[PDB]
Amino acid sequence: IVGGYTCGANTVPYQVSLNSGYHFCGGSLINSQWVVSAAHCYKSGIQVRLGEDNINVVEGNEQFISASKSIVHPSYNSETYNNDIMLIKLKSAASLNSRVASISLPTSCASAGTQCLISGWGNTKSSGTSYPDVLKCLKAPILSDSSCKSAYPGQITSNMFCAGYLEGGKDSCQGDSGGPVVCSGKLQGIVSWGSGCAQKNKPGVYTKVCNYVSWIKQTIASN
């Protein structure tokens, strides 16, 4: 997250870190047994880490739980990142508490201008490299589809939306992928892609979760 702030320990209790020996992607807890992330974060051997703030220090509220299965969206395209969403099942149910909490799925899509909360442990530098060890947060609005499409001609589908600032300075970044975009208490987006980070006229692009609520609900009920 570039241009954001330190969230505060466990203030974003649905935020999970995906670990395979190291943090590599964000995710969102959506009930005690399931995580939503981005399909481009797929790999085998995932451990989901819940209740994290400093991902390099055991601070006493963590739950580390291995994935028992991952399900990449049936139409994910790795070239275009269309349908960039995946589900991960926990080998055992998480213990839900004030620091380990699920986030609600949308009932409808959000509209342009809505303010969202984006968070993660990704790079905080627009040029060069600095990874934070504590969770970072950013408030940013959903941009109009025309502004989105204009910045990225031919690359935006109906399953994507842009959020951020066209002026630059504030954006998600490498290492934030898979994490949440929450607007009005609902998971509306997944950190998916962008051009650099926090660059002018290149906002972040997010998976539009509201288009997948039926697939999510049906898939978790059948797995």
Ligand X SMILES: N=C(N)c1ccc(O[C@@H]2CO[C@H]3[C@@H]2OC[C@@H]3Oc2cccc(C(=N)N)c2)cc1
| Residues near ligand X, by CB under 6 A | 80-81, 155, 171-174, 176-177, 191, 193-194, 197, 204
Strand-pair category, 47-50 with 115-120: unpaired
Among this protein's residues, is 40 annotated catalytic? yes
37 marked as binding residue? no
**What is d(CA 119, CA 117) in angstroms, rounded to the nearest whole number?**
7
In this complex, which beta carbon is closest to Ca ion, that of residue 59 or of residue 167?
59
Q: How far is the CB of 77 from Ca ion (least distance, A)?
A: 34
**Cβ 159 vs Cβ 211: under 8 Å:** yes
Sheet of 5-6, strand order: 5-6, 136-141, 115-120, 180-183, 186-193, 204-208, 160-163
Question: Is 70 labelled as part of a ligand binding site?
Answer: no
Is 54 or 144 the residue whose CB approaches Ca ion more closely? Answer: 54
The question of whether 84 is a catalytic residue gets the answer yes
Q: What's the DSSP call for residue 25? A: E
Considering the complex, what minimum distance in angstroms separates the CB of residue 133 from Ca ion? 8
Question: How many other β-carbons are positioned within 10 Å of the β-carbon of residue 157?
Answer: 15
Which candidate in 23, 28, 40, 102 is catalytic?
40
126 known ligand binder: no
Burial bucket for residue 134 (CB in 10 Å: 0-12, 13-18, 19+): middle
Question: Is 23 in the active site?
Answer: no
| Residues with catalytic function | 40, 84, 177
Q: Which amino acids are annotated as binding site for substrate, given as ranges?
A: 171-172, 174-175, 177
Q: Which amino acids are annotated as binding site for Ca(2+), given as ranges?
A: 52, 54, 57, 62
The residues binding Ca ion (CB under 5 A) are 52, 54, 59
